[PDB]
């Protein structure tokens, strides 16, 4: 598959995020327990709540489509559907909102992805969400200064950075510590304080942010200069326009 046109680093990074054969660079290690804490849906050691009985316990009639589609593990179990939501700075965060939704529906099964300017969300069965979330948090999808895990009060994608290079957060869930140069997650994604903070590593430096970013800007790579990418967008506009009129 092709994924996206263009000849910039931005375009290549957009392709790489979508391509499930591209190995996402892992930048930080997070424990299973800390991913559960960040998500904030259940406490460590708490059983997965259920929304319906295990599929095995149900008495479903013959359906060729069901038979051919393997349910994700959390569907088999009857897990609740839960979410993880990220905000990405327009100051060169590595991932960005449509990049995420496009990538998620290439890489992940059973996924409900939503894109907005200030927030991007995936909803799926809880145990599967935990596995996906580890990857979203440990890899280059995430920078702990220019991205934020936020289930509410999302403002900041379009704001100026603070003096530490951190994105604004009304609820200050991610705190830069000068003494380590590392960011700690001190609250879960909905804003409730964690008993013990989670190390999220060092912010990426300017050079590395520019290598990895998927936003086009005049002070990075400008979209207007990725003429092949613009060409395809204009093509789609014209072909849609013609088709709506007379199917030519």
């Amino acid at each position: 598959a092709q994924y996206y046109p263009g000849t910039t680093k931005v375009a290549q990074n957009r392709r790489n995020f979508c391509n499930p054969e591209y190995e996402l660079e892992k930048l930080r290690e997070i424990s299973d327990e800390d991913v559960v804490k960040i998500l904030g849906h259940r406490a460590p050691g708490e059983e997965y709540p259920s929304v319906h009985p295990p599929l095995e316990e149900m008495d479903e009639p013959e359906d060729a489509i069901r038979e051919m589609v393997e349910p994700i593990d959390g569907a088999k179990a009857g897990d609740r559907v839960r979410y993880i939501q990220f905000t990405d700075s327009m100051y060169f965060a590595p991932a960005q909102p449509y990049v995420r939704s496009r990538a998620y529906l290439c890489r992940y099964r059973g996924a409900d992805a939503g894109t907005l300017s200030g927030r991007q969300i995936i909803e799926t069965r809880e145990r599967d969400l935990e596995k996906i979330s580890k990857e979203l948090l440990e890899t280059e999808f995430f920078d702990p200064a220019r991205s934020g895990v936020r289930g509410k009060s999302v403002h900041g994608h379009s704001l100026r950075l603070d003096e530490d290079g951190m994105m604004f957060d009304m609820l200050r869930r991610q705190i830069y510590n000068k003494d380590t140069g590392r960011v700690e997650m001190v609250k879960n994604q909905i804003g409730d304080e964690l008993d013990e903070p989670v190390d999220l590593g060092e912010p990426l430096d300017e050079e590395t942010l520019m290598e990895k970013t998927t936003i086009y800007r005049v002070d990075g790579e400008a979209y207007r200069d990725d003429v092949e990418a613009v060409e395809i967008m204009q093509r789609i506009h014209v072909l849609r326009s013609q088709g709506g009129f007379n199917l030519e």
Binding site: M90, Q96, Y216, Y223, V230, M233, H237, G244
Partner: peptide
């Protein structure tokens, strides 16, 4: 369409319903 590709975002969750139907419905009869 250009904006959405440039910044990898556009509006709120539901902003471009009309936006995506838009090009095709401009000259429809």
């Amino acid at each position: 369409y250009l904006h959405k590709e440039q910044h990898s975002r556009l509006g709120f969750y539901g902003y471009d319903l009309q936006d995506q139907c838009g090009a095709s419905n401009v000259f429809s009869i």
